[PDB]
Structure formats: C-alpha cells, structure tokens
Design a protein around this ligand. Sequence first.
Ligand SMILES: *[C@@H]1O[C@H](CO)[C@@H](O[C@@H]2O[C@H](CO)[C@@H](O[C@@H]3O[C@H](CO)[C@@H](O)[C@H](O)[C@H]3NC(C)=O)[C@H](O)[C@H]2NC(C)=O)[C@H](O)[C@H]1NC(C)=O
Ligand SMILES: *[C@@H]1O[C@H](CO)[C@@H](O[C@@H]2O[C@H](CO)[C@@H](O)[C@H](O)[C@H]2NC(C)=O)[C@H](O)[C@H]1NC(C)=O
Ligand SMILES: *[C@@H]1O[C@H](CO)[C@@H](O)[C@H](O)[C@H]1NC(C)=O
Lengths: 39, 183, 135
Amino acid sequence: IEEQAKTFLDKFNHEAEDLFYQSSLASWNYNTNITEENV
Amino acid sequence: CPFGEVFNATRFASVYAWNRKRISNCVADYSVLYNSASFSTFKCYGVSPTKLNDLCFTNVYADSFVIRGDEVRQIAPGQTGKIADYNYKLPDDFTGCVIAWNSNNLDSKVGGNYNYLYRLFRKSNLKPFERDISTEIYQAGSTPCNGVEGFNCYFPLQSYGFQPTNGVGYQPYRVVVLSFELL
Amino acid sequence: AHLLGDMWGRFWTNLYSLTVPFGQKPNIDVTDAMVDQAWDAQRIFKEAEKFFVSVGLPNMTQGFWENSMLTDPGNVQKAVCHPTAWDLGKGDFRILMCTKVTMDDFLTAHHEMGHIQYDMAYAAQPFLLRNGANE
Ligand SMILES: *[C@@H]1O[C@H](CO)[C@@H](O[C@@H]2O[C@H](CO)[C@@H](O[C@@H]3O[C@H](CO)[C@@H](O)[C@H](O)[C@H]3NC(C)=O)[C@H](O)[C@H]2NC(C)=O)[C@H](O)[C@H]1NC(C)=O
Ligand SMILES: *[C@@H]1O[C@H](CO)[C@@H](O[C@@H]2O[C@H](CO)[C@@H](O)[C@H](O)[C@H]2NC(C)=O)[C@H](O)[C@H]1NC(C)=O
Ligand SMILES: *[C@@H]1O[C@H](CO)[C@@H](O)[C@H](O)[C@H]1NC(C)=O
C-alpha cells in the first residue's frame, strides 16, 4: 500500500543525510590535506 | 524565583522527554530575561512581554529541551511537523512565552553528538502538554513483528547527529517554554 | 585532423592566435587593474557575493567563510588544487579552489558560486531529489 512507502522513505531520509555527510566530510579532509592516513 | 538551573544548566533535556519545572511562589523578574539580548527568539502569546513584571498568576511552568535550528517555528500554538505532532504539543490558547537561543558550542561535538534523540513515529498526535517516553516498536503494514525490525517496522527514535561544522538551521538550539497558568 | 588546436579537435580555442580578426586591438584584460588596487584573495568572492545579492539571491551562509579554503594554504600543503563546489549536506556549503589574482579566476569565482546558489535553493526538497532537473 502507498502509505507504507511514505513511512519507508522517512526512515531513509534520516539515515542517509547523516551517512552521506560523514562520507563526504572525510572526502574533504583528503582533498585539502593529503596523507595516506586520510585515504 | 530561582532561574539558575532552569536556564544556565550544564546539560539540557531531550526533545522527546522534555523536562518540567514548576516554578512556584517567588518574585519573578521577566525583565532580566526580556532585555538580555542573548536570546534569538522571545515570543509572547497570551501577553506581550513588557507587562509580565506587572501581573500575578497561580503557577508558572518551565519546560526545557533541545531541537534543531529550524524546528523552533513548530513551538507555537497551532503548528504541525515531526516535533509538534508527536514530541511536544502546545495548546491552542497558549498563554506563556517561548524563548530560544543557539547553543552550537555546548551541545555539538566533533564526530557527532548522538545523545539527542527525537521521536519520529507515533500512532496519534499528542494532546497538548502530553508526554510519551515509551519505546515499544512501531508497526508498518498489517503484520505481527513481535519486537524486531524488518520489512515495514522499526524503532521509533532517531538521533540528531550534531556536528560543529553544520550550517545554521542544523545546529542545536536550546528552548524554554514558560507557561503561566491560573487555576 | 592534426591542425585543430588539441588532440581530438574538441575545442578550436587554441586557433585564436592564427584566426584573430584584428590583431592590432588588444582583447580586454583586467588583470593589471587588480594588482594595482591591492585586491586580496577575499575581494574576488566579496564582489562575487555582491553580484548575487544585486539580483535578489541570498547571501553566503556565514559558515562559508571559515570552512572554505580559498587559496592553497600557507603550509606547502599537498591538496588537489582544482576549482569545485561542495555540498556536504546539512546546509554546509564549501568552495575549494586555489585562486590567483587574475580575471580568469575572477570569472570562475562567479561560475563556482553559481553552483552554490543553485545548491542553496533546492535544499528544502527530500534527499533523493537534490540534483539538477537533468544532467
Ligand atoms: C547565567 O544567567 C545569568 C543571568 O542572566 C547571566 O548573567 C549576567 O551576565 C551579564 C554580562 O553580560 C552581567 O551584566 C553586567 O552587569 C554588570 C554588573 O555586574 C554591569 O556593570 C554591566 O552594566 C552589565 N552589562 C550589561 C550586559 O548590561 C549580569 O550582571 C549578569 N547577571 C547577574 C548574575 O545578575 C550569566 O551570564 C549566565 N551564565 C553565564 C556565566 O553566562
Ligand atoms: C592532515 O590532517 C591530519 C588529521 O586531520 C593531521 O594529522 C594529525 O591530526 C591530529 C589531530 O587529530 C594531530 O593531533 C596530529 O598532530 C596530526 N599529525 C601530525 C603528524 O601532525 C595532519 O597533521 C594534517 N596534515 C598536515 C600537513 O598538517
Ligand atoms: C547580506 O550581507 C550584508 C553584509 O555582509 C548585509 O548588509 C545584507 O543586508 C545581507 N543581505 C540580506 C538580504 O540581509
């Protein structure tokens, strides 16, 4: 049913925004200061 | 009136289990509040702010919690959203005042402060000033799901992961809601 | 195919010195007027922010000014130097470039700020719809 999909995406929209953040914040620290302990 | 704790606390309270201090017989000076200029939001609803230091009630309640920056607009009479629906609901004839100030340096910590949760699923919106600290699993489409995540079903609490490098509107704000009542 | 200005003939932009219509007229270049008024690294973006507030678009987010790295650092710091605009999430927008005082990087400052103002506008949609409308 359609209302089950709305409750699916809200759970997604909260877990993704944090996991995309850190995964892109760590790509910033590699791009502006290169070590291999950043890669 | 001992506003000490109630304001300058070292650790606030979650948004899904707000606190509730019942200020009582005292000498309250809302001027030190009103003019402190440290507050980013000071709205008064039942009564304009300057006339507070000239009235008397029966009880003042003070509720305290921590939310995101752009969720301070749901702490008002007659709103909707994840916070006002089921975390903290204000009646439709509110009387007190709502105060809020940014607290990025105290509550946000590098790596993410995962200790500030909020409820994001409930059966029905809260009654005004009602509180719900249960954790019983949710319930998606018709199905048992005897305590256990999975297809259409999952915990009801999420956590702000606050970070210090978060644009405004994503940084933690501390909120205090004063509610004057007259039994 | 081997006389077009690059390896594949994709751009003909390296044929300008052979195909210039009037070579006795200098094509306008404001790089000397930038180093005659002591414009720092920060003036190029502050005049860029005044262009966008001139048309009715919001300011920079004020986290934009500390977190960003507008030049290569004062350290001899190994850091991929390539103009780009980042949208890390949670309303945190950063620009990474190594800007020199030139009208070339005066223009790509306006280009890279345009990616930011596009990013700041659709930040109220859900997460899976925060791209451009097509590629
Ligand atoms: C915990 O809450 C307290 C009550 O709001 C905060 O207290 C106040 O800090 C002010 C500094 O901005 C003090 O102000 C000044 O007071 C001196 C005399 O002490 C006057 O000469 C100055 O004119 C006056 N300046 C201003 C801004 O008008 C207040 O005196 C002080 N309130 C008290 C204690 O009576 C605390 O700041 C807060 N916790 C902390 C440490 O931040
Ligand atoms: C690149 O960044 C890393 C981490 O951000 C730096 O490495 C260490 O960072 C910690 C902070 O958590 C410091 O306490 C250490 O002193 C750092 N290591 C060293 C050897 O200094 C690293 O320093 C950065 N690169 C440069 C060139 O400074
Ligand atoms: C943008 O910032 C400038 C100062 O940096 C300020 O004067 C201006 O009012 C701001 N724009 C808006 C719409 O507030």
